[PDB]
Design an enzyme around this catalytic site. Structure first.
Site, PDB file in Angstrom:
ATOM      1  CB  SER B  27      -0.883   0.034   1.249  1.00 59.27           C
ATOM      2  OG  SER B  27      -1.528   1.295   1.365  1.00 59.27           O
ATOM      3  CB  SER B  28       1.174   4.106  -2.329  1.00 59.97           C
ATOM      4  OG  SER B  28       1.717   3.445  -3.458  1.00 59.97           O
ATOM      5  CE  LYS B  52      -4.911 -21.775  14.603  1.00 61.20           C
ATOM      6  NZ  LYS B  52      -4.984 -20.320  14.420  1.00 61.20           N
ATOM      7  CB  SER B  77     -13.881 -22.353  19.769  1.00 60.78           C
ATOM      8  OG  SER B  77     -12.851 -21.574  20.359  1.00 60.78           O
ATOM      9  N   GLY B 178      -0.893 -15.982  19.702  1.00 63.55           N
ATOM     10  CA  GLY B 178      -1.937 -16.611  20.483  1.00 63.55           C
ATOM     11  C   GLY B 178      -1.268 -17.682  21.322  1.00 63.55           C
ATOM     12  N   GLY B 179      -1.085 -18.854  20.721  1.00 66.84           N
ATOM     13  CA  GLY B 179      -0.435 -19.962  21.401  1.00 66.84           C
ATOM     14  C   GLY B 179       1.045 -19.978  21.067  1.00 66.84           C
ATOM     15  N   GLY B 180       1.417 -19.289  19.993  1.00 68.45           N
ATOM     16  CA  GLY B 180       2.820 -19.221  19.612  1.00 68.45           C
ATOM     17  C   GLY B 180       3.250 -20.028  18.400  1.00 68.45           C
ATOM     18  CD  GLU B 203       0.660 -12.185  24.301  1.00 63.13           C
ATOM     19  OE1 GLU B 203       1.355 -11.403  24.985  1.00 63.13           O
ATOM     20  OE2 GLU B 203       0.301 -13.311  24.698  1.00 63.13           O
ATOM     21  N   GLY B 207      -4.848  -9.633  27.261  1.00 61.63           N
ATOM     22  CA  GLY B 207      -4.337 -10.975  27.480  1.00 61.63           C
ATOM     23  C   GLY B 207      -2.876 -11.063  27.090  1.00 61.63           C
ATOM     24  CG  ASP B 209      -1.021 -15.568  27.856  1.00 63.01           C
ATOM     25  OD1 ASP B 209      -1.662 -14.868  27.045  1.00 63.01           O
ATOM     26  OD2 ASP B 209      -0.628 -16.730  27.599  1.00 63.01           O
ATOM     27  CB  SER B 303      -3.106 -14.599  11.414  1.00 64.79           C
ATOM     28  OG  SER B 303      -4.069 -13.757  12.024  1.00 64.79           O
ATOM     29  CG  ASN B 306     -11.637 -18.086   8.087  1.00 62.92           C
ATOM     30  OD1 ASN B 306     -11.984 -17.846   6.935  1.00 62.92           O
ATOM     31  ND2 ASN B 306     -10.733 -19.021   8.388  1.00 62.92           N
TER      32      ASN B 306
HETATM   33  N1  LIG Z   1     -20.124 -24.099   2.757  1.00 63.20           N
HETATM   34  C1  LIG Z   1     -19.537 -22.953   3.179  1.00 63.20           C
HETATM   35  N2  LIG Z   1     -20.362 -21.917   3.683  1.00 63.20           N
HETATM   36  C2  LIG Z   1     -19.804 -20.729   4.123  1.00 63.20           C
HETATM   37  N3  LIG Z   1     -18.441 -20.500   4.090  1.00 63.20           N
HETATM   38  C3  LIG Z   1     -17.651 -21.543   3.587  1.00 63.20           C
HETATM   39  C4  LIG Z   1     -18.095 -22.806   3.109  1.00 63.20           C
HETATM   40  N4  LIG Z   1     -17.105 -23.578   2.701  1.00 63.20           N
HETATM   41  C5  LIG Z   1     -16.057 -22.803   2.922  1.00 63.20           C
HETATM   42  N5  LIG Z   1     -16.317 -21.578   3.449  1.00 63.20           N
HETATM   43  C6  LIG Z   1     -15.412 -20.430   3.834  1.00 63.20           C
HETATM   44  O1  LIG Z   1     -15.168 -19.745   2.593  1.00 63.20           O
HETATM   45  C7  LIG Z   1     -13.815 -19.624   2.413  1.00 63.20           C
HETATM   46  C8  LIG Z   1     -13.369 -20.877   1.527  1.00 63.20           C
HETATM   47  O2  LIG Z   1     -12.081 -21.222   1.444  1.00 63.20           O
HETATM   48  P1  LIG Z   1     -11.577 -22.465   0.670  1.00 63.20           P
HETATM   49  O3  LIG Z   1     -10.182 -22.086   1.105  1.00 63.20           O
HETATM   50  O4  LIG Z   1     -12.019 -23.798   1.188  1.00 63.20           O
HETATM   51  O5  LIG Z   1     -11.465 -22.382  -0.941  1.00 63.20           O
HETATM   52  P2  LIG Z   1     -11.404 -21.509  -2.335  1.00 63.20           P
HETATM   53  O6  LIG Z   1     -12.599 -22.084  -2.934  1.00 63.20           O
HETATM   54  O7  LIG Z   1     -11.548 -20.156  -1.811  1.00 63.20           O
HETATM   55  C9  LIG Z   1      -9.703 -22.164  -2.325  1.00 63.20           C
HETATM   56  P3  LIG Z   1      -8.889 -21.765  -3.667  1.00 63.20           P
HETATM   57  O8  LIG Z   1      -8.843 -20.166  -3.858  1.00 63.20           O
HETATM   58  O9  LIG Z   1      -7.358 -22.044  -2.820  1.00 63.20           O
HETATM   59  O10 LIG Z   1      -8.916 -22.355  -4.868  1.00 63.20           O
HETATM   60  C10 LIG Z   1     -13.159 -19.813   3.768  1.00 63.20           C
HETATM   61  O11 LIG Z   1     -12.893 -18.566   4.438  1.00 63.20           O
HETATM   62  C11 LIG Z   1     -14.153 -20.778   4.492  1.00 63.20           C
HETATM   63  O12 LIG Z   1     -14.149 -20.666   5.902  1.00 63.20           O
HETATM   64  C1  LIG Z   2      -4.783 -19.427  15.435  1.00 61.73           C
HETATM   65  C2  LIG Z   2      -4.736 -17.940  15.019  1.00 61.73           C
HETATM   66  C3  LIG Z   2      -3.830 -17.003  15.591  1.00 61.73           C
HETATM   67  C4  LIG Z   2      -2.813 -17.362  16.706  1.00 61.73           C
HETATM   68  O1  LIG Z   2      -1.735 -18.221  16.255  1.00 61.73           O
HETATM   69  P1  LIG Z   2      -0.979 -19.140  17.331  1.00 61.73           P
HETATM   70  O2  LIG Z   2      -0.068 -20.021  16.547  1.00 61.73           O
HETATM   71  O3  LIG Z   2      -1.911 -19.711  18.330  1.00 61.73           O
HETATM   72  O4  LIG Z   2      -0.152 -18.062  18.123  1.00 61.73           O
HETATM   73  C5  LIG Z   2      -3.833 -15.707  15.166  1.00 61.73           C
HETATM   74  N1  LIG Z   2      -4.696 -15.295  14.194  1.00 61.73           N
HETATM   75  C6  LIG Z   2      -5.586 -16.186  13.619  1.00 61.73           C
HETATM   76  C7  LIG Z   2      -6.548 -15.662  12.516  1.00 61.73           C
HETATM   77  C8  LIG Z   2      -5.609 -17.511  14.029  1.00 61.73           C
HETATM   78  O5  LIG Z   2      -6.520 -18.427  13.453  1.00 61.73           O
HETATM   79 MG   LIG Z   3      -2.134 -13.877  25.019  1.00 63.21          MG
END
Ligand SMILES: Nc1ncnc2c1ncn2[C@@H]1O[C@H](COP(=O)(O)OP(=O)(O)CP(=O)(O)O)[C@@H](O)[C@H]1O
Ligand SMILES: *Cc1c(COP(=O)(O)O)cnc(C)c1O
Ligand SMILES: [Mg+2]
Ligand SMILES: Nc1ncnc2c1ncn2[C@@H]1O[C@H](COP(=O)(O)OP(=O)(O)CP(=O)(O)O)[C@@H](O)[C@H]1O
Ligand SMILES: *Cc1c(COP(=O)(O)O)cnc(C)c1O
Ligand SMILES: [Mg+2]
Ligand SMILES: [Mg+2]
Ligand SMILES: [Mg+2]
EC number: 5.1.1.18
Lengths: 318, 318
Positions: B27-28, B52, B77, B178-180, B203, B207, B209, B303, B306
């Protein structure tokens, strides 16, 4: 400083035009099991679905014109919120209700159906109180305690009052215990209609802060307990509630979630009524000591029936 | 005992057939603000929507036949759950996912869309772990740590690895903490491609920690913090993560939710990308010390993206 049966008797008169005189149910099955006569005061049939309507209405019915015109605000995640919403609408008082972004649809619709102005906040950042203070002070809104208020507990107490009037004196009374509003008010009725009645409060075993308080002699606080009795996850008793409890409550009992679930299914299949988890505490505790209730007249308060249909379906199939 | 850049380099090779080589955005506007050159590694564009996927796939790709046939189970979660669900489907491994009865619709649909077998539980009674242990032991299912696992952190580290390969050495790198897992893996890449790079974990102030652990020299635990960075509400760092952190991380920073919200809006209106609250930590921390980043090359990891569309809409209008 502390309410008396009189306030409960007045609260009865004060809410009579709007509260439901909930029915007292009986089960031959329960009686055989206990070798006694058991009476169920079903507040799940009360306006809004829980006893809370009583304390809320009683408290709101005693606000002055300026407050009534300015309105009230609630941020409780429990039945108190809709109790306030409906009472306020009944009394022509504006009501703002703070709810989580992901609050159950049915509860949100119920709240708006009661004319409540919904303000949402992110559950992950529980800054409800912060928001409540900022909003209530800026708009001159009144916040009625969910349990620690003399007017609120006197109102809840009217449920016990009605029980005795329909069935009579009792040897024991089992009541759900969260913050102590229902417990304290119920104690006032019991001591009047049947001075020789064992009054028991009941908490989920994972959160017996009330029990510790009862034994310690002073209010003990605890971390929020993990339990399905969502309406009894309070972290500490109230000042007004505990005071009456330590003087009129015989003892605080605890039950497991497994027992709550068994009671929930019994109410549904055997008595055909819908009761929320927290509303099963009193019946569960009673069943646990049924051996000690032979040939007595027992009273059981069913605090409410507001359970998300999804959790309800889930528990019923457990 | 501890992974090295090598494992990150191997993880890169191990996940290459399925992971996305997320883009590096610029981003400029950000550059002018910082009087520097800033690079954004956008893992919100990664498979499943968060970094992840990397650690999950890397870890699942290293399980033996018996485990792969038996399947895995997750109860997080956070994004780890869908990371596992999708990786498992990609690898032909059955996956059971424990989720709350009130989990967001979109997340549930995503999970089932990834072939995950959803098992629900009542949020009010968070007995997830209990259920997870009972189920995983009875069915011989494997549970991959969301962060405290050598294979998981090595995988997360591949995001940092790719950043440098596209842009080059850096003076500073800001990473969400978060967890590292992301923090530790990113440290391994940084120390390799640019040994003279300041590596910061970030962090939510409510939190810290991780910060206390970094200063204390030993892992400190805390009560779950109230913050909108739902993906960084962990209560303590992991063994493998902290070890690498104390040796390769220059310092842990903290930011407020207000700053996270400002960053979230900036990404949307100014950079046109959707980022979840937790994914804003690194950018927020960086902006806070921009005065100390003049004429340097800075790296910022996003990161994930979603975020429940309802919370997203809510934050955007704050
Ligand atoms: N049935 C559903 N209803 C609502 N959200 C969904 C879904 N299935 C997947 N998602 C969400 O939509 C996004 C989908 O990502 P996904 O990574 O599986 O594929 P894409 O179709 O975007 C991959 P690609 O670009 O790598 O080809 C994610 O953020 C996911 O959490
Ligand atoms: C899991 C997650 C984190 C934290 O990463 P850790 O490896 O637990 O430190 C941060 N941002 C997003 C969007 C995550 O899903
Ligand atoms: Mg923390
Ligand atoms: N719009 C709505 N959507 C879903 N549930 C609602 C609702 N409005 C109310 N409810 C719920 O349905 C039940 C309605 O109770 P309510 O007490 O307001 O009246 P009733 O119509 O049952 C009273 P009455 O029997 O005293 O005449 C409660 O348990 C409440 O939470
Ligand atoms: C509020 C509530 C309780 C607890 O009553 P307190 O007066 O806080 O002790 C119990 N059951 C239900 C269904 C409730 O709504
Ligand atoms: Mg009705
Ligand atoms: Mg308690
Ligand atoms: Mg994509």
């Amino acid at each position: 400083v502390l309410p008396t049966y009189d306030d409960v008797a007045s609260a009865s008169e004060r809410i009579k035009k709007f509260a439901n005189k909930t029915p007292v149910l009986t089960s031959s099955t329960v009686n055989k099991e206990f070798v006694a006569e058991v009476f169920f005061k079903c507040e799940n049939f009360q306006k809004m679905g829980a006893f809370k309507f009583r304390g809320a209405l009683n408290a709101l019915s005693q606000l002055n014109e300026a407050q009534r015109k300015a309105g009230v605000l609630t941020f409780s995640s429990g039945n108190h919120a809709q109790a306030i919403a409906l009472s306020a609408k009944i009394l022509g008082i504006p009501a703002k209700i703070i709810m989580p972004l992901d609050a159950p649809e049915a509860k949100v619709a119920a709240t708006k159906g009661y004319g409540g102005q919904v303000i949402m906040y992110d559950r992950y950042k529980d800054d409800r109180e912060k928001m409540a203070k900022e909003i209530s002070e800026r708009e001159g809104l009144t916040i009625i305690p969910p349990y620690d208020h003399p007017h609120v507990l006197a109102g809840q107490g009217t449920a016990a009052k009605e029980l005795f009037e329909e069935v009579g004196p009792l040897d024991a009374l089992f009541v759900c215990l969260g913050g102590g509003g229902l417990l304290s008010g119920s104690a006032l009725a019991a001591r009047h209609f049947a001075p020789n009645c064992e009054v028991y409060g009941v908490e989920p075993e994972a959160g017996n802060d009330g029990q510790q308080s009862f034994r310690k002699g002073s209010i003990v606080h605890i971390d929020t307990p993990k339990t399905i009795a969502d309406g009894a996850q309070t972290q500490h008793l109230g000042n007004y509630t505990f005071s009456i409890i330590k003087e009129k409550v015989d003892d605080i009992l605890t039950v497991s979630d497994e027992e709550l679930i068994d009671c929930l299914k019994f109410y549904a299949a055997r008595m055909k009524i819908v009761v929320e988890p927290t509303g099963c505490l009193s019946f569960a505790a009673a069943r646990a000591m049924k051996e000690k209730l032979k040939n007595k007249r027992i009273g059981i308060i069913i605090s409410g029936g507001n359970v998300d249909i999804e959790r309800y379906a889930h528990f019923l199939s457990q």
